Ligand binder design. Structure first.
Ligand SMILES: [Ca+2]
Ligand SMILES: [Ca+2]
Ligand SMILES: [Ca+2]
Ligand SMILES: [Ca+2]
Ligand SMILES: [Ca+2]
Length: 421
């Protein structure tokens, strides 16, 4: 939720006066790198003038600076206002508290307020070394902390025990719960990198997990995955994909994994929307056979908002929509990969909603899929996923998880879900 009107903000307003000392005002701001996004306080230098006043907290939307509304201004515009303020001069700040964090706007796992890593690290050490292992404590803490906070915990635990938190939990847990907790301990790039490497272990590759991660990850995410993957496994992600795929499926996976999709522009390119739609039709349903490289080219290179509009314009040319046309034109891992891709382009939270429903709908559970989605989307769009799930399937994601899983495993997943609908 965004609004550049102070008359449409719901939270509480806070007036504050700060003098810029030698180390700046003493706080870090975040947000504003988008068209419509707030500007919230990230961190406060506890020895700076910002933390001295005590009336500014993390998560406060900056409504105005020096009698000028900065709601809707970019990140570089309000940063130049505070830097032009010389040393010793005053700045006036109207803030607004009651909004989340922008980044984790639609996540289910939010940052824990009174965070104390040293207390968490001890409580987890006490849980580990309790006779019979206190799994409930380990689950209650780690699933109610942000991934950033779990990194501080693993650091504190290592300083205290001289042992890695991941190693200690590996030797204390087992089964599905172990997989959940160890996944939650990795950074998003680390977790995705490890999931990708696991999907390519052995001769037979898990094409379903490779497709899920490569198709759903963004340019920024894929950039970091590629960096961390070579860090961990001493090889480029691209080469491992080349080695474990072939044909057009390899072409599609290598192109997506580059994370070089065009970024969403400021102008809608209607002539190109229509030409790309026409090109997708001529290359498949219109003709005998399929021009797969043309599909791969358009669907990996255009920005997501662009491709959403070409798929609707594609309906003007083809009697089948893009999903139907994929099934009609192509088969196998290529078909699966295309289907997953344009699902992620049209509606990604719905795409995960269906993946979660598919993992639970039948006999047993596809735990590897369920766990990976609950872990990797808990701080991204879990709230949107839960909305699409409830709207389509009539009951909540929480309800299905509760039926399909049991034990501390279930409790961990339910925490990552974040509540009923
Ligand atoms: Ca136990
Ligand atoms: Ca073990
Ligand atoms: Ca393999
Ligand atoms: Ca055909
Ligand atoms: Ca089931």
């Amino acid at each position: 939720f965004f609004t550049r009107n102070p008359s449409e903000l719901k939270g509480k307003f806070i007036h504050t006066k700060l003098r810029k000392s030698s180390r700046g005002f003493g706080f870090t701001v975040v947000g504003g790198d988008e068209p419509d996004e707030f500007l919230q306080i990230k961190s406060l230098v506890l020895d700076g003038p910002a933390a001295l006043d005590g009336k500014m907290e993390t998560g406060d939307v900056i409504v105005s600076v020096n009698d000028t509304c900065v709601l809707g201004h970019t990140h570089a515009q309000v940063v130049k206002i505070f830097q032009s303020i010389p040393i010793g001069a005053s700045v006036d700040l109207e803030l607004c508290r009651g909004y989340p964090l922008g980044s984790s706007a639609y996540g289910s796992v939010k940052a824990y307020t009174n965070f104390d890593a040293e207390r968490d690290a001890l409580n987890i050490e006490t849980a580990i070394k309790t006779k019979g292992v206190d799994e409930v404590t380990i689950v209650n803490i780690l699933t109610n902390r942000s991934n950033e906070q779990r990194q501080d915990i693993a650091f504190a635990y290592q300083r205290r025990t001289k042992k890695e938190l991941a190693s200690a939990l590996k030797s204390a847990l087992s089964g599905h719960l172990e997989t959940v907790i160890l996944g939650l301990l990795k950074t998003p790039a680390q977790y995705d990198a490890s999931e990708l490497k696991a999907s390519m272990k052995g001769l037979g590759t898990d094409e379903d997990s490779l497709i899920e991660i490569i198709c759903s990850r963004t340019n920024q995410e894929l950039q970091e995955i590629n960096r961390v993957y070579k860090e961990m496994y001493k090889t480029d992600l691209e080469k491992d994909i080349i080695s474990d795929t072939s044909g057009d499926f390899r072409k599609l996976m290598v192109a997506l994994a580059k994370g070089r999709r065009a970024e969403d522009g400021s102008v809608i390119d209607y002539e190109l929307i229509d030409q790309d739609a026409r090109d997708l039709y001529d290359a498949g349903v219109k003709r005998k056979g399929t021009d797969v490289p043309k599909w791969i080219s358009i669907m990996t290179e255009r920005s997501v908002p662009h491709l959403q509009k070409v798929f609707d314009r594609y309906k003007s040319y083809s009697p089948y929509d893009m999903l139907e046309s994929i099934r009609k034109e192509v088969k196998g891992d290529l078909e699966n990969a295309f289907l997953n891709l344009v699902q992620c382009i049209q509606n990604k939270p719905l795409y995960f909603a269906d993946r979660l429903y598919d993992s639970m709908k039948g006999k047993g559970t596809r735990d590897k899929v369920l766990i990976r989605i609950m872990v990797s989307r808990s701080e991204v769009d879990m709230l949107k996923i839960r909305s699409e799930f409830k709207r389509k399937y009539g009951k909540s994601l929480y309800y299905y998880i509760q039926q399909d899983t049991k034990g501390d495993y279930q409790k961990a997943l339910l925490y990552l879900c974040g509540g009923d609908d």
